[PDB]
Amino acid sequence: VVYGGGAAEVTMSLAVSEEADKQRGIDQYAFRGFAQALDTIPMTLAENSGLDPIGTLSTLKSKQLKEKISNIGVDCLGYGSNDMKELFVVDPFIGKKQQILLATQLCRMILKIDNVIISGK
Amino acid sequence: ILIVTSNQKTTISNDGATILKLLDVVHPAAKTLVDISRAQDAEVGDGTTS
Amino acid sequence: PSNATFKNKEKPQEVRKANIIAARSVADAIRTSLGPKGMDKMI
Amino acid sequence: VQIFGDQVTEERAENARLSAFVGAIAVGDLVKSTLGPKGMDKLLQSASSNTCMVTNDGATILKSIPLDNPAAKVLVNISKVQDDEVGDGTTSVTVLSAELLREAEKLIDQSKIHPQTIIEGYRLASAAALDALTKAAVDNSHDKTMFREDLIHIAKTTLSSKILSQDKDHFAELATNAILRLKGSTNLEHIQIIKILGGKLSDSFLDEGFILAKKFGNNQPKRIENAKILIANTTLDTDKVKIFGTKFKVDSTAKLAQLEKAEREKMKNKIAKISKFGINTFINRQLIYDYPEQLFTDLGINSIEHADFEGVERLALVTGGEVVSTFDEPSKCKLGECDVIEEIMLGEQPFLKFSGCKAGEACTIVLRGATDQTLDEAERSLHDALSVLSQTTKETRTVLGGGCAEMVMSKAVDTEAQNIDGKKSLAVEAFARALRQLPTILADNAGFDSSELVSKLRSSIYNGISTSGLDLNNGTIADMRQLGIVESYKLKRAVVSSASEAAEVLLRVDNIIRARPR
Amino acid sequence: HPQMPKCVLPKEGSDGVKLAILTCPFEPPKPKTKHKLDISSVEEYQKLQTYEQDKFKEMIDDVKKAGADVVICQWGFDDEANHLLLQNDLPAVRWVGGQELEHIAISTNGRIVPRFQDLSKDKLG
Amino acid sequence: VILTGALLGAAERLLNKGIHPTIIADSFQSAAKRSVDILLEMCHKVSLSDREQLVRAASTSLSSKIVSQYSSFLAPLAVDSVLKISDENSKNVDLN
Amino acid sequence: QKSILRDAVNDLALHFLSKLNIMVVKDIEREEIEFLSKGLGCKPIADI
Amino acid sequence: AKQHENRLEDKDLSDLEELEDDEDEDFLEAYKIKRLNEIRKLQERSKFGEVFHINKPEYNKEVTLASQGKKDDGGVYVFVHLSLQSKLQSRILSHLFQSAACKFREIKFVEIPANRAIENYPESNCPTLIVYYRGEVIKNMITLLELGGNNSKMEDFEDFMVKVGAVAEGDNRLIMNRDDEESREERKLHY
Amino acid sequence: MIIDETERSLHDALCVIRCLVKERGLIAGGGAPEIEISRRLSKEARSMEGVQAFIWQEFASALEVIPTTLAENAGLNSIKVVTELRSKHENGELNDGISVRRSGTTNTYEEHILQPVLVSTSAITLASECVKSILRIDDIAFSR
Numbered sequence A: 001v002v003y004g005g006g007a008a009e010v011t012m013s014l015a016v017s018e019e020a021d022k023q024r025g026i027d028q029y030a031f032r033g034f035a036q037a038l039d040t041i042p043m044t045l046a047e048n049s050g051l052d053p054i055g056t057l058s059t060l061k062s063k064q065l066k067e068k069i070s071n072i073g074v075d076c077l078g079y080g081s082n083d084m085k086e087l088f089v090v091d092p093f094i095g096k097k098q099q100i101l102l103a104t105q106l107c108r109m110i111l112k113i114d115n116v117i118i119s120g121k
Numbered sequence B: 001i002l003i004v005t006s007n008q009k010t011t012i013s014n015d016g017a018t019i020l021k022l023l024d025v026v027h028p029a030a031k032t033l034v035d036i037s038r039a040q041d042a043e044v045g046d047g048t049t050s
Numbered sequence C: 001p002s003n004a005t006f007k008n009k010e011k012p013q014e015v016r017k018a019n020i021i022a023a024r025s026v027a028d029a030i031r032t033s034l035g036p037k038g039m040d041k042m043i
Numbered sequence D: 001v002q003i004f005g006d007q008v009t010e011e012r013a014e015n016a017r018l019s020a021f022v023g024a025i026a027v028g029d030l031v032k033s034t035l036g037p038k039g040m041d042k043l044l045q046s047a048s049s050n051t052c053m054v055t056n057d058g059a060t061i062l063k064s065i066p067l068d069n070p071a072a073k074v075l076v077n078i079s080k081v082q083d084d085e086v087g088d089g090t091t092s093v094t095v096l097s098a099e100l101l102r103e104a105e106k107l108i109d110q111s112k113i114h115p116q117t118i119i120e121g122y123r124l125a126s127a128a129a130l131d132a133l134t135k136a137a138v139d140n141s142h143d144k145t146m147f148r149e150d151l152i153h154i155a156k157t158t159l160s161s162k163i164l165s166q167d168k169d170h171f172a173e174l175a176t177n178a179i180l181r182l183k184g185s186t187n188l189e190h191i192q193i194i195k196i197l198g199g200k201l202s203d204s205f206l207d208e209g210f211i212l213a214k215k216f217g218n219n220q221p222k223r224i225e226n227a228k229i230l231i232a233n234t235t236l237d238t239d240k241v242k243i244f245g246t247k248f249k250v251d252s253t254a255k256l257a258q259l260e261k262a263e264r265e266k267m268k269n270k271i272a273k274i275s276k277f278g279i280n281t282f283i284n285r286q287l288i289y290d291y292p293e294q295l296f297t298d299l300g301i302n303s304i305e306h307a308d309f310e311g312v313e314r315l316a317l318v319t320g321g322e323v324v325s326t327f328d329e330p331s332k333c334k335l336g337e338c339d340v341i342e343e344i345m346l347g348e349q350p351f352l353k354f355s356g357c358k359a360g361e362a363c364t365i366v367l368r369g370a371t372d373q374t375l376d377e378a379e380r381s382l383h384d385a386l387s388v389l390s391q392t393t394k395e396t397r398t399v400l401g402g403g404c405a406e407m408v409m410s411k412a413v414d415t416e417a418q419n420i421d422g423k424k425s426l427a428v429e430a431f432a433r434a435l436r437q438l439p440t441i442l443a444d445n446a447g448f449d450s451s452e453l454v455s456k457l458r459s460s461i462y463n464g465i466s467t468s469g470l471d472l473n474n475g476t477i478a479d480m481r482q483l484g485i486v487e488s489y490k491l492k493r494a495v496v497s498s499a500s501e502a503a504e505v506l507l508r509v510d511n512i513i514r515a516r517p518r
Numbered sequence E: 001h002p003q004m005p006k007c008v009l010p011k012e013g014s015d016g017v018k019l020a021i022l023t024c025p026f027e028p029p030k031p032k033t034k035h036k037l038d039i040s041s042v043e044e045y046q047k048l049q050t051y052e053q054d055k056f057k058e059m060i061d062d063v064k065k066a067g068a069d070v071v072i073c074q075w076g077f078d079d080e081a082n083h084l085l086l087q088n089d090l091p092a093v094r095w096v097g098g099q100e101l102e103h104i105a106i107s108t109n110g111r112i113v114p115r116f117q118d119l120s121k122d123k124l125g
Numbered sequence F: 001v002i003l004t005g006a007l008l009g010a011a012e013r014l015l016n017k018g019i020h021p022t023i024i025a026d027s028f029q030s031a032a033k034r035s036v037d038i039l040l041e042m043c044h045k046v047s048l049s050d051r052e053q054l055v056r057a058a059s060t061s062l063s064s065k066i067v068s069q070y071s072s073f074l075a076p077l078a079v080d081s082v083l084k085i086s087d088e089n090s091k092n093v094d095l096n
Numbered sequence G: 001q002k003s004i005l006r007d008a009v010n011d012l013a014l015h016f017l018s019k020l021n022i023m024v025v026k027d028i029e030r031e032e033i034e035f036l037s038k039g040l041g042c043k044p045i046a047d048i
Numbered sequence H: 001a002k003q004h005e006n007r008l009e010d011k012d013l014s015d016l017e018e019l020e021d022d023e024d025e026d027f028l029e030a031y032k033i034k035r036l037n038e039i040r041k042l043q044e045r046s047k048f049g050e051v052f053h054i055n056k057p058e059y060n061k062e063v064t065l066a067s068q069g070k071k072d073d074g075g076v077y078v079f080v081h082l083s084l085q086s087k088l089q090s091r092i093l094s095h096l097f098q099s100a101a102c103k104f105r106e107i108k109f110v111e112i113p114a115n116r117a118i119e120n121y122p123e124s125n126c127p128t129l130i131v132y133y134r135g136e137v138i139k140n141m142i143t144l145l146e147l148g149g150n151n152s153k154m155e156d157f158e159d160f161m162v163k164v165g166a167v168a169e170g171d172n173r174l175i176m177n178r179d180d181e182e183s184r185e186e187r188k189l190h191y
Numbered sequence I: 001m002i003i004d005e006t007e008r009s010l011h012d013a014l015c016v017i018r019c020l021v022k023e024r025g026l027i028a029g030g031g032a033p034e035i036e037i038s039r040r041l042s043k044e045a046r047s048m049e050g051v052q053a054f055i056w057q058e059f060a061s062a063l064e065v066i067p068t069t070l071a072e073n074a075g076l077n078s079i080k081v082v083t084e085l086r087s088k089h090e091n092g093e094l095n096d097g098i099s100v101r102r103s104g105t106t107n108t109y110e111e112h113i114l115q116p117v118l119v120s121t122s123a124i125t126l127a128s129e130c131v132k133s134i135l136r137i138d139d140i141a142f143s144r
């Protein structure tokens, strides 16, 4: 299992950013687009919960880069602690994996389309 | 290439074999490219666009 | 948290998005007319 | 860009919301006049076949009226299932659900509180309300005299809003006596509603035994003393033999005449099997042909044909016997007995009246009135009364009515409003004002001042006493135990639970997607 | 039939109610193919009345031999058949969907009989 | 029918006079209930069969139809039709 | 009686009754059997 | 124009022989071979001819599979009858099925009790006549007040079969077109 | 057409006699019982002193339409005829009413204008129940 709720996403994100730095050229900018694309999920949870996305995103990026513990995410119910060990939240690995696989595999098909013919009914 | 026929069913493809099959061609001269594409698809199965 | 201000209004940000896309549509029409490699536009 | 298609209405976060609330206001203002004892009945005119319908029940008003609003369809369905569960109190669900959204409209606009925060206040407020409703109840059924009196008060409280409000002193005896005759069996199919034109509303009389709209045969007598009753789900019709696929091959018509003789001898032996018991009447589910009908003449047996499926169980339970079809073994299947089998006439249609049966587990409510619209109101009125009193047999706990249940529930909600920090405490108070708005509406329909009686009732109950209520006849506060106003515990529990879920569904909305109609 | 008891409990031993599940309903036996039964003079007409009357007697003895307490079929029983079950304190449900019939046997640790001649104690619920 | 419309005409002006409809409705039910008791004192009982009263009552009760002037022989026809069915319990005589 | 399902009379049956000087009628309503039986005092017949 | 078409169109294989001496052989025999082939097709399609008293398990096959027939879209019409012996109209409709079954052998005539057909279907609703064709319900007919009610006749039932497309309008088996021999005899004398 | 009228006409004659055999009461006609109920309730109304009494005055006034309608159909002046109904009823307690043949007021029992009490009872009773149902209506909403 994993621990989602922005945690997973934030983790993934810092990972990608470091790797992006280890990459030079047209590829780095990409990796950066994949990093910022993963950040939209916890920012959406921060937007719906009313918390500031600036303080929320900056705290997760700064904290997760410092500490190696990767189960801290966006607390939407307004608790005082963001550590998800105490909040009783668990998600499966096969479920969170398919979000990235079916998304990145679809968008390859969406980007390849050049000619778009729509026969009016 | 994204094609949508009159029956409103999407069909996305890269090879020219089924793209030309979806577009019902009226002109006989343009049907020559469609016949060789299906013939190349039937015989070999590669190079239908080239 | 629950005490946060919802602000009751999503129509303003949607109208601003409609204006930005409408403004970027015509801005991208004349993007290829800049520099020595620009192209003329006959209207 | 355009994402839905042609002729598709879409709304986003300011047209989506405030379209359901105004729909909740639109559906609530209709049923506002129908609430209470002094409420006015609404008349529904159909669009086709010029069919009119006079009805006071909020569920039936919403059944017939078309409503294309999606938010109003939620109120249409919750009144339907509330009529399915209890049968009474559908108007209170629609009023309380609309006023909860009316208050929440102000909390979203004025106080600027998130919708999810409003629900969290309603969860704690609803829990405190049901806990006060559980503690405010009182046990019953230990003394049959008190259980008899409480059903009379529940029948008076239910029929006070319907057309039987003036004659509820007489109809309360008719309503409560039929329920005690059920012997615990909770089912409404055992009660018949016979429509008779003529007379006045108070002419409805309690029947001893069971009465139905059937008729004797052509040759049968009028009166038989101490008649044994039998019920056949049989086919005394052209029986055929059931191995469908039988045909008759005939070489000569000599044996075909003897074959038809065997068919008449086959049914003769079947009617001879009936006479082994020595019954005095014979009740069949379907039509009886003439040749069986002539055979009951010399044997001294009455005949009743074309009995409904419900009428079989409704007559068998009063008789006490069981439905028999084989007629093979006379040892088992002991039949009942009835003293008076003489029919009577009420109007232009004769009805077979029975009297002096073994058991009265099924009943029949004879009604008299002027217009069929009044009889339809009489049917729906007593159906709500008998439905509430029937479920009171299985669920014993009750609660005081007259608006005291709403205010005593809001007392614990207001008590638990102070110790809750955050912005949801205002939503907890919004739930309290929703409970207060029900007795505010009871005073409006009666034509008296609402702010004074609500203020006097609210200040009186916080002093320490919890038996006060609204007396709309005199227009002042009085003791509900003296007037004898009490309702069931499951009714108000279902109303508060359904109204809490009603506001929860419509408050979790942000967009409306209305596809193209067929 | 609505006169049957609502709640059915077990008696002194064999706490399982022995739920018998059936595919073929309480009906006269006949083949699928089109057929016409040639009925002769009055001797054969009176004989077939005893045939079906002995069939129901053979039917109720077969169920009581198996010792079932609840019987369910996918199709409705005949009328006469609805009363014959009610006499021996043997309730029945009728018209149980075909897709719904298979799920009942799995929970009850039983198996559906194809016909009534193979009915025995081991295959009851 | 005539009377009803008349009482609705009485209730028409009473609605303008600031009286509730339920008070107007209950007043007619109490007034109608008293009206029955007044006629029960005024009505006179008759015998089981009386040609002087029944024939004259049947003729003067039709009073509007085409056969009212033919009632010299049809009013005895109606009395003789019902008198064949007689009972002391005052049953509802069926016209079948 | 009316007897829409099975033929009430035919030319053969009318001929035998014509010699015996017996009148016959058809198209009798099922509801009027009570009136004819109780009026004329004749019980119905449904078997020979 | 119609005078030339009435020689062939308005004469069956038995009536076409009248024009053997008058009309040309090649003109007549060319059409007789055509009409003879049509008669052979009806004989092969005559898979029925008596009322199929069925039961439910079977409905899922007899009523519907048949309606598909060969599935050459060889569709087959299947008239179902939800019988109820207590009703008077049901026994009348059962007689019409056996009468029509002896004539129209290509059309399937199905009968079943209404109590065994649908769970708790109202008894009042039946006698119910359903017409299947290629698995689809062509007509869900209600009680026979439309077809005269208690006074329903064989002529009214045959007219209903023409409306649903089960029998052609100019079919020689229909009583509307099947004029009596005495009727045609008077026409020839008065001609 | 008149044969259909003669059927329902004789149905009224059998039904009127059916009212007499089921209930032995017999009262006069020709505007007799309508004025009696309005006269007897007028004395009882003034002694009550309430808003219910004011409704009973209109109940007594609206009940006088039956002899008023008889005056208009006969062509006589309603006020002159109804004035005679008031002048003769304080002494004549019953059987005083209108006779159409002479076109005036006379003793109806001598002229043999009688009717059952159940007819007038059902008229006053059913009329009050119909007004009870109509006045409770507040809205006219279209439905399916």
Ligand SMILES: Nc1ncnc2c1ncn2[C@@H]1O[C@H](COP(=O)(O)OP(=O)(O)O)[C@@H](O)[C@H]1O
Pocket: A004, A005, A006, A074, A075, A076, A077, A087, A089, A091
């Ligand atoms: N109580 C909670 N605390 C923290 N995170 C939560 C909580 N509830 C839900 N989440 C997060 O919000 C996400 C919401 O997913 P959900 O909306 O239920 O699935 P879907 O998006 O398919 O409808 C989850 O992946 C989870 O990580």
Ligand SMILES: Nc1ncnc2c1ncn2[C@@H]1O[C@H](COP(=O)(O)OP(=O)(O)O)[C@@H](O)[C@H]1O
Pocket: B014, B015, B016, B045, B046, B047, B048, B049, B050
């Ligand atoms: N990995 C590669 N590197 C370079 N050239 C390639 C590669 N793969 C394919 N090609 C060339 O590009 C062309 C691709 O043909 P393409 O249109 O992709 O497939 P098809 O011809 O079957 O539709 C071929 O002519 C091939 O010579």
Ligand SMILES: Nc1ncnc2c1ncn2[C@@H]1O[C@H](COP(=O)(O)OP(=O)(O)O)[C@@H](O)[C@H]1O
Pocket: D034, D035, D036, D037, D056, D057, D058, D088, D089, D090, D091, D092, D156, D157, D158, D160, D161, D401, D402, D403, D404, D442, D470, D471, D472, D485
């Ligand atoms: N006689 C009465 N006196 C005071 N209040 C009453 C009386 N009868 C009913 N009520 C009040 O009317 C409210 C709703 O009554 P109810 O029977 O549910 O009407 P409806 O069936 O139209 O919803 C109850 O909450 C009750 O307190």
Ligand SMILES: Nc1ncnc2c1ncn2[C@@H]1O[C@H](COP(=O)(O)OP(=O)(O)O)[C@@H](O)[C@H]1O
Pocket: F060, F061, F062, F063, F064, I012, I028, I029, I030, I031, I032, I066, I098, I099, I100, I113, I115
């Ligand atoms: N011969 C008569 N003279 C005076 N008044 C009559 C006579 N016959 C009937 N009436 C009056 O006419 C009124 C209406 O009677 P009628 O028209 O016969 O009622 P319906 O036709 O509805 O039975 C009665 O109230 C009665 O008093």
Ligand SMILES: [Mg+2]
Pocket: B046, B047
């Ligand atoms: Mg390739």
Ligand SMILES: [Mg+2]
Pocket: D088, D089, D157, D158, D159, D161, D384
């Ligand atoms: Mg109520």
Ligand SMILES: [Mg+2]
Pocket: F061, F062, F063, I012
């Ligand atoms: Mg009259």
